[PDB]
Write a protein that binds this ligand. Structure first.
Ligand code: ANP
Lengths: 560, 578, 117, 117
DNA sequence: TTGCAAAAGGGC
DNA sequence: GCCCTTTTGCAA
């Protein structure tokens, strides 16, 4: 608890105050040192600040010629630590430069920067203790403070914890290069949240088939295996179009009791049970396209409910669906005119077609518009996966149950984009409707975010803009800050940045967040796997390096 | 009443004149200090200027080696407070840089900058007291040798502050603002989200309502944060503020959830709130306004471009004449019914000489029989009535309101001239048609305002949110309003959160500014480019995220920028209540 | 031709007013346009204007365009930026004026009261 | 996946090759592209490259782009600019060998003759 | 025979 | 990407 060095200068460098530090030969010989990027405490006028070590250089002190002295000593071949202490004692100095980030006030709130410049004579620098660092971070470990790979610059007892107040309701960003720990960090956060706070729902837009089962030695285990290890039962809902294959995999990996941990559902519905759903999907498809859906489609969409009571109109609609290509189950009857056909058979279908209005006839004539729906049709399902997901996430019965929803987007094929957009729009509309009665209280995991947050009119863009009001969070990973719009980057509240190689990425990051200007050099120069620079608002508005943990070790530690 | 230091230099740097200041060890040991951005008084040759600390750095004075002296003192654990006074005095110094902004001449007049560079020997720098600070804040530019205007009453807006630094607040120093600055002049309110924008907007609106009771307001409430206190804080809304101020019958809330909003208003205001807020529907009844329905259907094509159908064109042009022919009004109503709009219970339609109640299924079928067993375009409209399908979202029986016309009557009514109504539109209730309705309403309001030129001015203020969305289009009605509203007495007050997106023309031509913390460099750069006086606070804005801290600058006769701690709406209401 | 707020009418390079500004000297037609923002006026028109009467401007872009159009205003750009004085004007009448002269333009009242003698 | 003249392929709508480059790691799908000029490859793909094998580059923009995309390549830009030697390559491999090393690549005939035994 | 809707290929 | 053309089919 003694000052490390002596302050010998200070100034207002741009928007940040700074001051220079000097390490005397006695301290240098004792073994004291300062690591670049280290956090130190600065005392000035009875107020403690938080400073970061920025730069270090060697500069002569007093009237001396270090070059000549050292060169002459080397020439004469005199050991400089045992023969000439009086010559080694006048060249062993070293300078440091420190920047004041701000001071903590009241209930942990961070007062930024400072308008007051401290005089040299009365400014001291003390090394920060573990208790002080723990207080700084705090006001189920996610990662412990570490300064690079330097031994002695790691503090396993200083950790950052997971709290729904940090994630739910706020947007998080997760950058980094390919293969550095973004997915591992996402899974760590999700597992810790699902184990600590079971009233937080999730929606994982899986795009690589990695968040449920993962066995290959190229990524951390899957959420299913993590839940099995941690003993979390009946909380995962899997939506996929490969029910049998995924059941085989779950049986072969999770064991014979896999049905407790994972519940598998299909992404197929029978449209002969939800003609309104079919018409709504067809109408929404074009609106998500350019614009201006046709008048006949608008009329059908608005008036199918009234049409439901007229068997002739409904027969026209069912005929249109059958003509589009969708296969009905065995034994279907259609009441046209005064007759009951069986469209499941060739002759009955032909007779009905030969036999065949307020708007149904135009739909029947233009039946090719429903062809795309064959990517979802499966006779005998009657599920309405969209509605089921809506109840799973925003259901009124929950009031806190915990529900992890994973969608196997790859199984769909070329309909995944449209399906995702439609589902997100439905969920956001329901959440807006529910405002004032209950909060959604769930998180939207999004990977490869640059595909979704491009257009300003997108539903994902609107969600990113307006989700905090209704309690809808977000957590997106993109591998490159340059691919996200500045409009979103500025408004993002949390950051988790891994190694970045391109100068454009670091420039964009520092442009979006000013405090990220002090770590650009570290990011550019150090390709370390699992090293993260976290920045959380508003309690911790400064960059703190961390050492993210492996999912296997997190599981093994949480078991006890 | 004594100098804070000794001036040791001066020069003209760029367009401004600066002088260096040095603080001696004795003063540094008495606690005397200067905060960046502080205002100080400079007395040079019998004249008084206004300074502003701009920088601070340490530099040796005389012949001394501070680094070696301090290192040697430290290694021997010598305490440089009560052990080595000579060593402390030889090195205890500190430099500051000050910029002259002008002088207060005559009776409150302000003379910007200076043409005389002050000599070092005769220059003295003093600290400025509260009375001097107030009189400085109360000064503004004037032509020449002219007495002050002595204008209307003024209301407190905030008090001077220099950030979160202790001793940097002057609660007794309050910037007084005349609300007339906000009338007919476009204002900008930048800053991050949740940093006091809503509070300052509410304060401005309350000041206008209390001062000018003859000015209306069109509040495009996107966030539903202006009528009642949100279920996230305790700050009162506009309705509660008006109730406290005792202003009656000046609010008109247009929404589509009238039941819920009336419930909320009752629970927050009492039972007599009907004396304050008139809740009105946002849903139209097209069975009373076939002209409106036809206009919408016809103009949809044009807004999408391409030549509209001839039958729609002639129907839109001749519906007024057709209203005198029941044999054609029957065709129009049948077309609407086929489109699908649900009619009110008991509607009677007279075809030929028969009376039909189209609200009944069998009667509708009989009317269909009679109509199917060429009177202008009525038959064509009945045939193609599927075009009116999209209107089912806007339709609700038994409304007879036509809010698009009610708003125009409220805002530009000759019989309503005086005590402008505060129209508040609850946008989130309109789903995906909110932008369409907003654009249509703004266009039809601007057309009426331009038409009324000469007879009377519009005299109302438009409140906008997310202005970067609407001001991006150079051909947009909102851009046209921003350009030309002052001519017809139409103001504006837009909060963007990102200045860079707003066009440079709009930024340059804006009269008032209220800037809060900005996170991006581009926004600060564009702000400095747009306005010169904002060149000194860029660093503070960039790297000081303080809630409630605003830099105000009101054109055109304001000398410099002022950092303020805007007052809260509760305290403003209490002050006005007296 | 006395034109007020000329940035609205001189913006379009095909408009009749742009045509007049560019080609009126041949038919003995003058012009006198007030804009308050030199940034908007086309550089083609700016480079070809003979007389100038510049008052306080509060945009570095406006001052930049003015300096680019006319070199002599480089000695007064700084005062133009920093000094908002009322009735204070810098005048430069091409082509035979040595430098830029600051003036306190006489009041119309005084001009009238002197023109009768 | 080996593809010469990769500047042609690394550009398209919907980016099949962008997807391959940015997501082939998980499935063991590696790329090895020769472009002959760093300035012709998009940064979005350059920043995702782990290995490098750079021969002499004459232009200055090429070396500047290379340094911008990979930091440690700033210590050999002068050598690349000034020394046009055939077969001299600077090899960089993350994360096992995160620094630039010069090499003298072997002729294929010599490799075959040495490996025949 | 004409007018209008709705889908798909051409030019720039 | 954006903007016109040609064609078919169902009114009338
Ligand atoms: N904190 C860590 N400690 C040790 N190994 C780690 C850590 N984080 C990640 N890894 C390993 O790094 C490799 C990549 O893991 P992964 O989380 O998939 O990175 P990634 O960012 O998701 N790849 P990508 O999706 O392309 O960006 C795996 O072999 C992990 O085991």
């Amino acid at each position: 608890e003694s000052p490390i060095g002596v302050v010998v200068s200070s100034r207002r460098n741009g928007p940040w105050a700074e001051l220079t530090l000097v390490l005397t030969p006695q301290e240098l010989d004792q073994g004291k040192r300062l690591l670049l990027g280290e956090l130190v405490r600065v005392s000035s006028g009875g107020k403690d600040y938080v400073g970061m070590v920025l730069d270090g250089y060697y500069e002569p002190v007093g009237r001396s010629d270090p070059t000549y002295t050292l060169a002459l000593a080397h020439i004469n071949q005199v050991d400089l630590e045992k023969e000439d202490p009086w010559a080694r004692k006048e060249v062993n100095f070293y300078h440091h430069r420190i920047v004041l980030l701000g001071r903590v006030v009241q209930g942990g709130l961070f007062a930024p920067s400072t308008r007051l410049l401290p005089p040299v004579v009365e400014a001291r620098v003390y090394r920060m203790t573990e208790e002080e660092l723990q207080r700084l971070l705090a006001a189920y470990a996610f990662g412990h403070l570490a300064y690079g790979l330097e031994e002695g610059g790691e503090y396993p007892e200083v950790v950052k914890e997971v709290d729904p107040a940090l994630f739910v309701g706020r947007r998080t960003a997760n950058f980094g290069k390919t293969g550095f720990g973004k997915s591992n960090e996402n899974k760590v956060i999700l597992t810790l949240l699902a184990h600590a706070f079971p009233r937080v729902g999730m929606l994982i837009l899986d795009q690589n088939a990695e968040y449920l089962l993962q066995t290959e030695a190229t990524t951390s285990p899957g959420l299913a295996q993590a839940f099995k290890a941690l003993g979390i039962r009946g909380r995962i809902r899997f939506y996929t179009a490969r029910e049998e294959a995924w059941a085989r995999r779950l049986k072969e990996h999770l064991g014979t009791e896999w049905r407790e941990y994972v519940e598998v559902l299909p992404l197929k519905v029978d449209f002969y049970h939800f003609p309104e759903l079919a018409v709504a999907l067809a109408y929404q498809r074009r609106r998500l396209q350019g614009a201006e859906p046709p008048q006949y489609l608008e009329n059908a969409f608005y008036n199918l409910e009234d049409w439901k009571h007229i068997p002739d109109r409904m027969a026209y609609v069912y005929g249109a669906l059958r003509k589009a290509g969708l296969t009905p189950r065995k034994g279907l009857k259609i009441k046209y005119k005064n007759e009951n056909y069986d469209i499941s058979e060739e002759k009955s279908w032909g007779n009905l077609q030969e036999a065949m209005k307020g708007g149904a006839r135009e739909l029947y004539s233009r039946a090719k518009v429903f062809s795309f729906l064959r990517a979802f049709h499966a006779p005998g399902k009657e599920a309405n996966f969209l509605e089921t997901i809506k109840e799973d996430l925003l259901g009124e019965k929950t009031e806190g149950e915990g529900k992890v929803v994973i969608l196997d987007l790859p199984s769909l094929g070329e309909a995944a984009d449209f399906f995702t957009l439609r589902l997100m729009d439905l969920l956001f509309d329901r959440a807006v409707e529910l405002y004032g009665k209950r909060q959604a209280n769930f998180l939207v995991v999004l990977e490869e975010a640059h595909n979704f947050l491009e257009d300003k009119a997108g539903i994902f863009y609107r969600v990113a803009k307006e989700g905090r009001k209704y309690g809808i969070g977000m957590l997106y990973s993109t591998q490159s800050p340059a691919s996200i719009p500045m409009e979103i980057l500025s408004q993002t509240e949390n950051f988790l940045v891994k190694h970045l190689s391109s100068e454009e990425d670091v420039k964009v990051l520092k442009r979006a967040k000013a405090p990220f200007a002090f770590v650009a050099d570290f990011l550019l120069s150090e390709p370390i796997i699992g090293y993260s620079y976290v920045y959380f608002e508003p309690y911790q508005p400064f960059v703190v390096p961390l050492r993210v943990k492996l999912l296997e070790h997190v599981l093994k530690s949480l078991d006890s």
